[PDB]
Design a protein around this nucleic acid. Structure first.
Ligand SMILES: [Mg+2]
Ligand SMILES: [Zn+2]
Lengths: 53, 8, 83, 39, 78, 103, 158, 263, 1111, 94
DNA sequence: CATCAGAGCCCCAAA
DNA sequence: TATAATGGGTCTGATG
RNA sequence: GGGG
């Protein structure tokens, strides 16, 4: 309660809609989210996949 | 939408 | 704008690329109406035409490289020294 | 694949797609691939 | 009705062979041989002309029949 | 050298520019001779010779005759490869809408 | 290096860990027939118990190998990364574990046997629902991976 | 419209979609000249439309037209162009190819990293044109067309023929491919080592990239023709030149199974 | 030899006739061995009693009869004919205006007959009709997924005999009805039955939310006929609500036992679920003047009371094996028979109102054709009519007990999800949980459990023994998955002191779920562990020690065991290897007691006790569908006293009556220099010496000589432009002699054909006139051996137009068939496997001197790799080897029942006895212990295998009890540093052999339109370089290698011709031109009115047709 | 691995320019029957026939060996196209 | 809330 | 060529 | 319908 949020910071838990993120926080924010959120899946399986791909 | 039924 | 890979794949400049992917008719009707010229920039475009792809040995950066020995490079140097 | 600066002409895009796709078969548990597709 | 157009009188004869052969089959308990058909067809009909009439009465098969065309080698171009 | 590949709409005029003849009959090939029926879907009069450098009725049968159209049968003497390249056309009584642009 | 049936060394600590579970299990069934615990509470307590038991015998399987049989073929093939992982080795020597119902929820009764001791038909059958579900899943999924790879080649090829 | 073995005829579907249209067009030209009523002409014009639409994209609107006595929709122009079985994907982005074969793969522990075991029987057909020219140049036959007659009966083939093939394949590589090709290392170049027998011999270290074991897997062989194709295969696609994964950067050719067990 | 057998479970009833699911279904469908009066109204009969009578003149059906087959089974296989029977039908044409009756027996064509083993011969090829599994007809209540609180009622009838009807209760509180994708208040339909608002509150009445939420007033204000005309308009926009056009359509849709049919099972199900009696297999009827209801209100009453909490109301599990039923061969065929009988009835009504309404016999009023077609169609084009799998006797036996959920009336590969492929708790005892494909079809194709039997309604039943109090009866009871769910069923191995349950706590099931219960509460006990699995799965010894994923592969690979000439049954069996040979009918037994008269390689003769001398001829070396050689060898000698059911001849893959899919080889589990790597297998060259893993294979080559408009083809010996060396093995006529070795390129049948206007082109005429000879009329078109084929000619068959009893298809003169055999030894590439899922390709064949041998000089046969065991988790092969080790020295074979076999103690006891034979002879034969055996023992001691401080004898025995032995490297003589597991294993040679798969092409056939190479080895095809392989070359940046793949090596007609001429001349390949498949793309776009243009950089069009397309 | 591949990758800025150089030079040799080779007889690649040691027919093998020596110069715009095809057809007849 | 377009690769024998 | 005959027989996601 |  009474905390300080960024424009585009999750308030509920769960996945973020990247289109709501693009409008709120912009291109770089979305590109960061997509790369990290995808990598979270491959790392879980034990797949070393370089980010640049 | 059915040619036979239309002509009939 | 943010598009998924399918919508982004179909929205590309090359109709040869998009037609060969998905929604073949939709891609072709809108292309024909607009009289789209495909510049053959990507790889699928050149694979459909059977051209040397613009990558690897095909890249324009390395495709024109010439080879010549010194016993020959210097044999053509003198014939082009006087007239 | 060579631990050195990439050569000009490398079909980077295609490599990136094969790199992301090949591990795809072994993705169990949106949780798992479905989540990769959702992104 | 035929992808290979047949003169309307020849169609009449092809149909006639058909109605005749079915008649025979229905009073023989089996499919009639070419001889039995030439017999019923009447005078001027030998087994040879029954066979030849069926040979030209054969309608073409589709190349896209699940594909059947994939197994046909092109003989024309060297 | 090829460098671009344009795609656009063919006018009825151009669709006739390509065409080598009008297919007037639904006939395919002759049931006796197995040869292409006249003004049918496989007529050599239109789409070209079936045999390399030879007209239908065999009047001209060699490459000493290239581009000549036989007067008895009306078939050009050229490479029979053109049967893959030569367009024909059907002149419609009334116009019909191209379904791709409707649906 | 060979594989003999005796190389699936059943750790002596197994009998104990089962006994401790059969009694910790009999206490959570008191609370259930005594009304203390609800049905959701019972199921969740039992499942936490046996996954915890499973970890205890997998430790025991590997500790028994390292301390006593450091050159046991199964241990050596797993340790070196030549073949097998802890959970497969656990199924050869310790116990099979808990198996899935067709729906997706766990069975409350676990397969107590290992492949060395040999499963009962009902143990063998209960485990069939899980195997079959993984094969179906592996099949319907291979299709979507391929489709995904094609979209990716198609968006990046240039 | 071609005659098959059995003398029977096999015809493309497009002809029956054209005959459909030409009948309806011709009957319309006749119905117009004969001044038929409105209800008749409009019914004919509708059918003419519906014939044009079965020819360009059969099934899109209304019922798909079908040859009688079979529920198979006829193969319209659209159907030919599109889908996985369509023209683009099945014939332009991927073709079948000459100078290629497949066979069962078998482990070849004795192979150098850049090598594979290629059955001499496969190598003969795959390099057949090369083998003819070499046979004429040595003298094992007098003209290339006689040499091809020699290799046509398995008995007529002599011993010096197999020594000619060895001269032929010298220094040149062949491509090995296992399906599915999930990444570029599904195709790798190899110096072929001629072997008796039927099976292809694979190097144990390349089995991980191919995901090939020996429970029955087969692999495709491909012969790079041109000097350019040979140069690309030997420099860029040689197994020994591709040791690190392109995705992670980690080693791909690396000890596994028995190799690790021994060490 | 001695056959020790383990197991303490006493199996009462034995396995049922394993092919009855086929044999019984069809015999019941046909009833040819039943006198017409006595026929029940089912199958073929029921079809006739549904299509007839025909109401115009009224034609009627009296009886049918089946004749005797025109040709014997062997003669149908031989002549490519269908083994079938003539079908006649006695009909009578009753003129419903005069009363005239002309009767006659009309020929309706032939019906294919099922052979003794439950298979079919369609066009001389054996075929099997795979049973289908589908959702049972009946009423089903399933919960709404969009609306958690409400449910949905569904009324499913038999496939293509009625529409699916759904009764969703829309957001509004009156109940809706969705039929044929329309929707409308069920209120209107209910009025048509004659329902009055009082009978809704009176019959229903209890849910004023629903009983009274359904009754709407605008609908009730109209008579049963007034509403029947309202709904006929709510479902056919266009037809004019006539009161004889509405009662014709609706009656036929819902009340007519000719278009709508709840099956005989659908009746029972709906009766039980709703607790009513259904008079007919149909939802409504037309009685006394109007429509009387039967199902609509019972259903509605149930659906409502299950939006409360009313007893008995429960949703249905549509995957329960009480709600899914099997459609056997009889029902599958009868359904196509009912379809080809309704078309014949259509042509009857069309001839009955045009012709001569009084001049009509039944004969010229019935055209069989639409019935011959439908039947011929089910057997040749159906997805359930499969080319028979007769690789070995077990292949066909498994094929016939297979169950498919796909096909006409079932699912579709893409139409099926997770729910249908799951193992349902009710599969237990009915559908094997292991037997199923790996891959796309997983869970869609399955196998009938061993003791399972399909009942008359089509539900699978499994046997259970009755427990009363604590006494188990020998009484057996077959149950459906619905009956089963009412009982606590104990497990098969529950301890029994005689007929009493010996145990205080017994392991049971209650509605599939596992429960620990006391013997008081036990009602039924399992009959055996065999009743839970398939037949293949029941053939895997030590199954209880194997991972399911690997037991599946071992089940399926048995179907692929090629019959071997020295085949032998496994050393470790499960006790089914005899019933399988018996029921597959590949072997030959004694009909009654008697003595054997003569015995020969061709025939056996048996002087039976009845005096009658019977002569059984023996299938000798007949080609099967997959080309394995089916061959029956004699197993009795002249004068042998044979009792009833005694073995007279072994079938293929049979040894003295036991299934013999492979061989018992001496195996050694140990890495071997890499030739063992990743599942490959190493084998001793000794196996080829004693012709182990050698199998015969027969291939048939066929050629036609037909009439042409250019001349007649001729099967001559006079082939042009040839030499006598090429024709040396051809007879007078031009056919290769029986017994000749043919290799690739060899002529099998000489043939000539005339050429066309290809009548030698001048540069050819000039060549021939130079060489003296003159161009010949005909050309060589003979049948040659294809690449990689060959063998010994064993039979030739000539059939000509004109010879007696033969007539070919139109235009064909003669047809010749040449059968070539090849004795196939094992070779590098051939695939082997055991019953546990261990499969591998022979990678190396070592000479006997390199094989790892035992200390007494015995070399091993096979060298498997231990790395294939831990991850796979198929330890059954490990036990199989240990018990195989004992049997090697004791000279025994064991029967170890599934889940009830030999256990480790027992095995150790045999190994100890065996150690005496392996080592006991040694220590009296004048030999002590070996130096290197001691060295190995020094390392075994460090490995915790042996007890320190015991003599070498006690320590070797300790290793022997663990199955390990001392093993010497054959290349060095030094011992393998450790003791290695060695013993006998049963391994099969699988149908996948390199000789079948090796293929290579330089150039060959191209495809008609694309000009790309044909596919397939049979077409001498090219390999497909698909999308992913192009991606691979792109990723390598191999531009020129790819370009050559897309042009020169495929469809660049210019470049591909020019490339070849450069390579035979020694010139580097030319730069490619345009692929012909792109020109086809351009032209197919012009065909769509689209103008494609290839341009330069100055946007000026570039012609890729080289001027051949413009005028 | 190809003999000295690591040094060849060191000679070029992109690995694909190495393949182009090797391929074009390999073709320069095949068209001129190896007359233009910058190797001495002792350097010449050989293959062991049944008869004996003979020149390696594989021109690509030569191109690489020749490349390592340093007796080959490569680069974009060194000499006009056909000015080169003229004075090499002259120096080494076909 | 309806309509349309997608739904992995290569190989075999059959038809 | 002339009785009369007159209306048929799954599964998800994107876009209007 | 099998293979991987
Ligand atoms: Mg594999
Ligand atoms: Zn002419």
């Amino acid at each position: 309660d009474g905390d300080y949020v960024e424009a585009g910071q999750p308030l509920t838990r769960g996945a973020i809609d990247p289109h709501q993120l693009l409008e709120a926080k912009g291109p770089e924010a979305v590109e960061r989210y997509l790369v990290e959120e995808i990598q979270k899946v491959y790392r879980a399986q034990g797949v070393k996949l370089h980010d640049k791909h | 939408s059915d040619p036979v039924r239309q002509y009939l | 704008l943010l598009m998924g890979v399918t919508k982004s794949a179909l929205s590309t400049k090359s109709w040869l690329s998009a037609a060969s992917f998905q929604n073949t008719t939709h891609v072709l009707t809108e292309a024909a109406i607009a009289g789209k010229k495909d510049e053959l920039i990507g790889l699928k475009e050149n694979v459909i035409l059977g051209r040397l792809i613009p990558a690897g040995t095909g890249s324009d950066f390395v495709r024109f490289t010439q080879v010549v020995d010194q016993k020959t490079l210097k044999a053509i140097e003198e014939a082009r020294k006087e007239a | 694949s060579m631990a050195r600066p990439v050569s000009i002409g490398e079909a980077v895009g295609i490599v990136a797609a094969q790199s992301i796709g090949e591990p795809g078969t072994q993705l169990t548990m949106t949780q798992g691939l479905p989540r990769v597709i959702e992104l | 009705a035929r992808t290979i157009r047949i003169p309307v009188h020849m169609v009449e004869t092809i149909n006639k062979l058909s109605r005749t052969a079915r008649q025979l089959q229905q009073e023989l308990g089996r499919e009639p041989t070419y001889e039995e058909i030439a017999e019923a067809m009447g005078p001027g009909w030998d087994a040879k002309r029954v066979e030849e009439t069926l040979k030209i009465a054969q309608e073409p098969v589709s190349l896209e029949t699940p594909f059947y065309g994939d197994f046909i080698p092109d003989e024309h171009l060297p | 050298e090829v460098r671009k590949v344009r795609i656009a709409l063919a006018s009825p005029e151009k669709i006739r520019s390509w065409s080598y003849g009008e297919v007037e009959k639904p006939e395919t090939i002759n049931y006796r001779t197995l040869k292409p029926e006249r003004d049918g879907l496989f007529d050599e009069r239109i789409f070209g010779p079936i045999k390399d450098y030879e007209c239908a009725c065999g009047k001209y049968k060699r490459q000493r005759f290239e581009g000549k159209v036989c007067e008895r049968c009306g078939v050009e003497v050229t490479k029979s490869i053109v049967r893959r390249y030569r367009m024909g056309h059907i002149e419609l009584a009334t116009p019909a809408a191209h379904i791709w642009f409707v649906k | 290096i060979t594989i003999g049936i005796d190389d699936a060394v059943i750790p002596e600590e197994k009998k104990q860990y089962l006994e401790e579970a059969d009694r910790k299990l009999l206490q959570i069934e008191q609370a259930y027939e005594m009304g203390f615990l609800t049905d959701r509470e019972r199921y969740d307590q039992i499942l936490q118990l046996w996954t915890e038991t499973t970890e205890k015998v997998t430790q025991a399987v590997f500790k028994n190998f390292e301390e006593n049989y450091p050159f046991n073929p199964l241990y050596v093939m797993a340790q070196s990364g030549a073949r097998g992982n802890p959970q497969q080795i656990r199924q050869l020597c310790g116990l099979r574990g808990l198996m899935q119902k067709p729906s997706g929820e766990t069975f409350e009764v676990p397969v107590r046997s290992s492949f060395r001791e040999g499963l009962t038909v009902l143990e063998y059958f209960i485990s069939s629902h899980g195997a079959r579900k993984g094969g179906a899943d592996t099949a319907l999924r291979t299709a979507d991976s391929g489709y995904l790879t094609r979209k990716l080649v198609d968006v990046t090829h240039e | 419209m071609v005659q098959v073995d059995g003398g029977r005829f096999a015809t493309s579907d497009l002809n029956d979609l054209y005959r459909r249209l030409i009948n309806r067009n011709n009957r319309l030209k006749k119905l117009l000249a004969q001044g038929a009523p409105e209800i008749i002409i409009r019914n004919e014009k509708r059918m003419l439309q519906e014939a044009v639409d079965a020819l360009l994209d059969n099934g899109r609107r209304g019922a798909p037209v079908t040859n009688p006595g079979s529920d198979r929709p006829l193969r319209s122009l659209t159907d030919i162009l599109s889908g996985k079985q369509g023209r683009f994907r099945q014939n332009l982005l991927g073709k079948r190819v000459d100078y290629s074969g497949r066979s069962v793969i078998v482990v070849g522990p004795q192979l150098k990293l850049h090598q594979c075991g290629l059955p001499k029987r496969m190598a003969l057909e795959l390099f057949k044109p090369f083998l003819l020219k070499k046979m004429e140049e040595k003298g094992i036959a007098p003209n290339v067309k006689a040499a091809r007659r020699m290799l046509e009966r398995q008995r007529d083939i002599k011993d010096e023929v197999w020594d000619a093939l060895e001269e032929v394949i010298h220094g040149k590589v062949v491509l090995l491919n296992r399906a599915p090709t999930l990444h570029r290392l599904g195709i790798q170049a190899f110096q072929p080592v001629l072997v008796e027998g039927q099976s292809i011999q694979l190097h144990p270290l390349v089995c991980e990239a191919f995901n090939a074991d020996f429970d029955g897997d087969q692999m495709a062989v491909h012969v790079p023709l041109s000097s350019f194709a040979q140069a690309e295969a030997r420099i860029q696609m040689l197994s020994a030149h591709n040791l690190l994964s392109p995705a992670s950067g980690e080693p791909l050719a690396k000890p596994s199974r028995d190799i690790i067990l021994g060490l | 030899m001695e056959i020790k057998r383990f197991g303490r479970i006493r199996e009462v009833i034995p396995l049922p006739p394993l092919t009855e699911i086929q044999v019984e279904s069809y015999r019941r469908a046909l009833q040819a061995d039943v006198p017409p009066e006595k026929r029940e109204n089912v199958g073929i009969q029921a079809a006739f009693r549904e299509t007839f009578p025909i109401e115009e003149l009224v034609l009627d059906f009296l009886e049918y009869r089946l004749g005797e087959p025109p040709f014997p089974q062997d003669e149908c296989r031989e002549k490519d004919l269908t083994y079938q029977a003539p079908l006649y039908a006695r009909l009578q044409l009753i003129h419903k205006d005069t009363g005239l009756i002309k009767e006659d027996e009309v020929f309706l064509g032939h019906i294919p007959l099922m052979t003794e083993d439950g298979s079919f011969i369609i066009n001389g090829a054996d075929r099997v009709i795979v049973s289908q599994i589908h959702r049972s007809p009946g009423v089903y209540f399933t919960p709404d997924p969009a609306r958690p609180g409400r449910y949905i009622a569904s009324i499913i009838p038999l496939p293509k005999r009625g529409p699916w009807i759904d009764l969703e209760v829309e957001p509004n509180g009156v109940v809706s009805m969705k039929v044929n994708k329309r929707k409308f208040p069920l209120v209107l339909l209910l009025r048509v039955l004659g329902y009055d608002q009082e009978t809704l509150a009176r019959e229903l009445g209890a849910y004023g939310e629903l009983v009274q939420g359904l009754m709407d007033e605008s609908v009730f204000a109209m008579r049963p006929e007034e509403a029947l005309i309202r709904l006929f308009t709510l479902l056919r926009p266009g037809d004019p609500p006539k009161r004889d056009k509405a009662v014709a359509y609706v009656y036929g849709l819902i009340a007519d036992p000719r278009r709508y049919d709840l099956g005989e099972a659908g009746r029972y199900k709906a009766e039980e679920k709703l607790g009513i009696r259904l008079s007919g297999r149909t939802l409504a009827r037309f009685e006394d003047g109007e429509f009387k209801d039967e199902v609509f209100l019972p259903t509605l009453r149930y659906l409502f009371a299950l939006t409360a909490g009313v007893p008995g109301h429960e949703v249905d599990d549509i995957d329960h094996l009480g709600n899914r039923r099997i459609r056997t061969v009889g029902e599958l065929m009868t359904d196509q028979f009912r379809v080809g009988l309704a078309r014949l009835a259509r042509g009857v009504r069309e001839r009955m109102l045009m012709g001569s309404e009084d001049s009509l016999t039944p004969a010229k009023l019935v055209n069989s054709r639409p019935l011959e077609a439908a039947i011929r169609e089910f057997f040749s084009r159906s997805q359930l009519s499969q080319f028979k799998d007769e690789t070995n006797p077990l292949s066909s036996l498994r094929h016939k007990r297979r169950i498919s959920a796909l096909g006409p009336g079932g699912l579709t590969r893409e139409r099926a999800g997770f729910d249908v492929r799951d193992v349902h708790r009710t599969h237990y005892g009915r559908i094997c949980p292991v037997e199923t494909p790996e891959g796309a079809n997983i869970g869609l194709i399955t196998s009938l459990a061993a003791y399972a039997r399909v009942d008359e309604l089509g539900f699978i039943r499994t046997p259970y023994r009755r427990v009363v109090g604590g006494v188990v009866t020998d009484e057996v009871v077959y149950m459906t998955a619905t009956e089963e769910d009412r009982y606590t069923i104990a497990q098969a191995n529950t301890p029994l002191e005689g007929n009493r349950i010996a145990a205080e706590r017994v392991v049971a099931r209650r509605k599939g779920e596992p429960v620990i219960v006391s013997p008081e509460e036990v009602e039924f006990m399992d009959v055996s562990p065999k009743q839970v699995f398939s037949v293949n799965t029941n053939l895997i010894p030590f199954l209880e020690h194997d991972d399911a994923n690997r037991a599946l592969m071992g089940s399926n690979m048995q179907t692929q065991a090629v019959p071997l000439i020295r085949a032998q049954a496994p050393v470790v069996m499960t006790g089914l290897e005899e019933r399988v040979v018996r029921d597959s009918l590949a072997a030959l037994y004694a009909e009654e007691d008697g003595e054997v008269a003569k015995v020969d390689g061709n025939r056996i003769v048996v002087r039976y006790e009845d005096g009658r001398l019977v002569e059984y001829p023996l299938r000798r070396f007949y080609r099967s569908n997959q080309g394995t050689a089916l061959d029956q060898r004699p197993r009795v000698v002249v004068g042998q006293r044979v009792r009833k059911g005694d073995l007279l001849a072994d079938g293929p893959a049979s040894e003295n009556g036991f299934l013999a899919l492979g061989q018992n080889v001496l195996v050694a589990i140990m890495p071997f220099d890499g030739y063992n790597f990743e599942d490959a297998i190493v084998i001793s060259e000794e196996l080829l010496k004693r012709d182990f893993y050698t199998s015969i294979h027969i291939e048939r080559y066929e050629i036609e000589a037909r009439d042409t408009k250019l001349g007649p083809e001729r099967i001559t010996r006079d082939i042009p432009h040839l030499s006598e060396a090429a024709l040396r093995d051809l007879d007078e006529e031009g056919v290769v002699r029986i017994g000749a070795e043919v290799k690739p390129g060899d002529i099998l049948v000489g043939r000539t054909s005339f050429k066309g206007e290809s009548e030698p082109t001048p540069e050819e005429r000039l060549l021939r006139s130079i060489f003296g000879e003159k161009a010949r009329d005909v050309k060589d078109t003979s049948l040659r051996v294809p690449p990689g084929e060959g063998g010994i000619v064993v039979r030739t068959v000539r059939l000509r137009r004109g010879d007696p009893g033969v007539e070919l298809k139109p235009g064909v003169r003669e047809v010749v068939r040449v059968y070539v055999a090849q004795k196939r030894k094992l070779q590098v590439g051939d695939k082997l496997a055991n019953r546990h899922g261990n499969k591998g390709v022979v990678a190396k064949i070592l000479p006997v001197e390199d094989m790892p041998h035992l200390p007494d000089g015995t070399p091993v046969d096979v060298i498997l790799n231990p790395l294939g065991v831990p991850s796979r988790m198929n330890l059954g092969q490990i036990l199989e080897t240990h018990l195989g080790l004992a049997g090697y020295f004791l000279g025994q074979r064991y029967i170890s029942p599934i889940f009830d076999g030999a256990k480790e103690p027992e095995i150790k006891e045999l190994l100890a006895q065996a150690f005496e034979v392996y080592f006991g002879k040694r220590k009296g034969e004048g030999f002590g212990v070996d130096k290197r055996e001691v060295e190995v023992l020094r390392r075994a001691e460090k490995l915790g295998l042996v007890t320190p401080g015991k003599t070498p004898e006690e320590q070797l025995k300790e290793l022997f009890l663990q199955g390990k032995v001392v093993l010497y490297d054959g290349r060095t003589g030094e011992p393998i540093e450790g003791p290695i597991v060695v013993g006998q294993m049963f391994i099969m040679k699988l149908y996948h052999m390199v000789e079948d798969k090796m293929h290579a092409r330089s150039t060959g056939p191209y495809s008609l339109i694309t000009q790309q190479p044909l596919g397939g080895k049979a077409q001498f095809g090219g390999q497909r370089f698909g999308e992913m392989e192009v991606w691979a070359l792109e990723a390598y940046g191999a531009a020129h290698t790819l370009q050559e793949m897309l042009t020169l090596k495929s469809d660049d007609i210019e470049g591909r011709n020019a490339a070849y001429e450069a390579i035979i001349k020694g010139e580097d390949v030319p730069e490619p031109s345009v692929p012909e498949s792109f020109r086809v793309l351009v032209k197919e776009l012009q065909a769509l009115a689209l103008d494609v243009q290839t341009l330069d950089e100055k946007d000026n069009p570039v012609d890729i047709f080289e001027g051949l397309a413009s005028k | 691995a190809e003999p000295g591949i690591d040094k060849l990758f060191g000679m070029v800025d992109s690995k694909y320019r190495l393949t182009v150089v090797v391929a074009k030079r390999a073709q320069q040799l095949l068209r001129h029957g190896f007359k233009n080779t910058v190797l001495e007889p002792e350097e010449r690649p050989k293959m062991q026939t049944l008869e004996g040691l003979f020149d390696d027919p594989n021109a690509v093998t030569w191109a690489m060996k020749e490349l390592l020596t340093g007796r080959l110069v490569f680069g974009e715009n060194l000499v006009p196209e056909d000015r080169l095809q003229k004075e090499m057809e002259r120096l080494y007849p076909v």
